[PDB]
Symmetry: C3
Subunit: 259 residues, 3 copies
């Protein structure tokens, strides 16, 4: 979708693309390594077996949806490797995963909510998937729109995230009482990460360079690198641990849920 | 995928983009509101229960594929909100869902045929999905190609829609005798909308500005807004009512199908 | 995603796009016809019945995943029809499926590995799908990157294909002993095509115009046309024949597998 490119003399001084590119490339490389390693660990732990006792799967293989967390983390890590390649080249690279904001998210976050719904057996998985998909596409549209109508696109996204976040929460509550306290301990932190950091993105939009202008694009890249390290890597680790505790309770010990 | 933009002095007079943009923006906003409200109603009615008696679901949740109609309608409504944003900005907006014809359809219509197949238990759901996908991509290619080879792409699309429409019809007939007359009443109008309005798009191509030149791009936008009002909103409402009648016959009353 | 176009005077002499376009268009048309016909034959044979005796399906329809091979072949054939349209127009066509290398593959090869996993009941189908997806996107990034960092993207792809190919092979071996010798005969040639021709693409990258410079873009197009003739058409035919033999062994004759 690219039309712009880095000028032969470099990015104009004072522009939003006049950024510390070696630093952002190093940060993206570190994030890539961490998130890819976390996803590899989640996949390996899932293949180890059910629960903390590593009870072998009856079919000999893990459920396919259970590998969503590791796949999302590895995909995010490879996206961050591409981002580091783009940043180390000075930005404006033909295959830039940094240029179009939230364009890389339309692959990870719908999958992330799908994994969250599959782990918690949340209803309307397709509805949540498409809600997150449309919210992220509204964000991409707002970030590529140079006029005031971007705040319309933002608002359109806010017309999707506000109900979805209000719906999911309620549904999550209906599941929260079902699970044992040991699994509830990890579910609490997964929900904290979700309902605390997902709302951060729309708030960070307001104070970005296309909002009040308080956060620059470089600071935006750093903040979103930390957010992806939290929203994908740490959230996936917490989902893996919650799944291990649930399998230990229900499959290893044979105990029923509080439903 | 964008390269062109609205010239600083505006669209050249007499060009295909010299269009009544406030009117098209208002039409797109009205279509967005109507289709999004219809999709919200479909999802709410699906969550109400099975059939006209609103019999509660045994699992407590509706089937995931049953929410396809409302999801398609909400996605189309948000696409039309984006279209109204693009039109009210004067067109040629970086995130324009109006520029590339049938590009927005590659998300709605494959899902639409998937929903139709799931509701009627039609065979080869993946085959129909990919047939519609390839037909719409051939249409996008024909609309972005400025040479005569666009009529090749159009022909390629006609090499996909003609068999598919001839196949689906036959398969639909095999299902039409299965359902009771009350459900057949809604199935008749759903099939009327399908086999009447889906062929309209290739016919409208012939008389468009890249065909015979009788229908301008503004008139094309209005006609396709009405078509999406019929093909997505009304067709989804008819699918919801047919599903309600089928659930009343088979689940509420326990009566069997005529198979 | 297009920004470049064929210059009004034509492609500059000596450039990578100064190619024999009538010849490439004819080759692409022949490949389109062959692959589309092969996919049509696979779908028709699948609809005929299970095994060589054409035992009717109990549900009256073939499994949906069983039609993946024919769908992939038909999609590749239509992509090659579009490629022939682009080449016959002189290249640089707005909807060019030839410009961005491996961009058309991100639709066929993830589906190809999905079909291979479904036919052989290979574990971690989603993992293999996403591994191939990310490998192909790394290839697209390497082919659109003009700097040395393309060899980074290539390396990133080599960081995905090398484990996946090493994993799938092992998993394939676990399935190879399960199947009878008659099905093993077709599985051997399917695995030969896979593990011989899939590694060819990264090797062909090294000697292409963005590598050592020994293979031109025209020769690359011809070689990849033959590869798609082998990797999609012949591999799909071998999958269809292996499925027929497996259904004859297990469904027609009722014999069990060697598991
Ligand atoms: C790892 C990345 C994650 C979890 C990204 C999440 C993204 C969102 C919650 C998106 C938020 C937006 C909307 C609420 C509308 C306005 C635009 C966005 C993209 C900031
Ligand atoms: C709500 C939108 C709908 C139902 C769109 C349907 C689209 C088609 C039936 C597409 C038709 C085309 C072909 C038959 C080939 C030539 C190009 C098209 C896109 C006009
Ligand atoms: C019909 C097309 C097929 C089977 C294509 C297969 C593609 C690959 C095995 C891709 C290979 C690549 C990597 C190993 C990384 C470097 C870039 C590629 C695209 C050459
Ligand atoms: K799961
Ligand atoms: K996992
Ligand atoms: K990007
Ligand atoms: K970005
Ligand atoms: K940017
Ligand atoms: K349905
Ligand atoms: K619905
Ligand atoms: K568009
Ligand atoms: K349009
Ligand atoms: K246009
Ligand atoms: K299969
Ligand atoms: K097949
Ligand atoms: K292409
Ligand atoms: K190509
Ligand atoms: K090229």
């Amino acid at each position: 979708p690219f039309y712009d490119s880095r000028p032969p003399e470099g990015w104009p001084k004072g522009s939003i693309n006049d950024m510390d590119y070696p630093l952002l490339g190093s940060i993206c490389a570190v994030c890539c390594v961490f998130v890819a390693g976390s996803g590899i660990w989640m996949l390996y732990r899932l293949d180890l077996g059910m629960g903390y006792s590593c009870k072998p799967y009856k079919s000999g293989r893990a459920p396919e949806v259970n590998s969503l967390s590791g796949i999302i983390c590895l995909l995010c890590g490879t996206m961050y490797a591409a981002k580091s390649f783009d940043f180390f080249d000075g930005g404006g690279t033909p295959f830039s995963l940094n240029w179009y904001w939230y364009l890389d998210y339309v692959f990870t976050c719908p999958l992330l909510i799908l994994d969250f719904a599959f782990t918690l057996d949340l209803p309307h998985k397709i509805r949540y998937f498409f809600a997150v998909f449309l919210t992220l596409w509204c964000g991409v549209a707002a970030f590529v729109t140079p006029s005031a109508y971007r705040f319309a696109y933002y608002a359109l996204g806010c017309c999707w995230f506000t109900p979805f976040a209000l719906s999911l929460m309620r549904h999550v509550k209906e599941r929260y009482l079902v699970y044992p306290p040991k699994c509830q301990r990890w579910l609490f932190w997964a929900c904290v990460i979700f309902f605390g950091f997902w709302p951060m993105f729309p708030i960070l939009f307001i104070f970005s360079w296309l909002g009040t202008g308080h956060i620059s694009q470089q600071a935006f890249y750093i903040i979103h690198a930390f957010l992806d390290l939290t929203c994908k890597s740490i959230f996936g680790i917490l989902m893996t641990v919650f799944r291990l505790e649930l399998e230990e309770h229900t499959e290893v010990q044979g105990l029923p849920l509080n439903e």
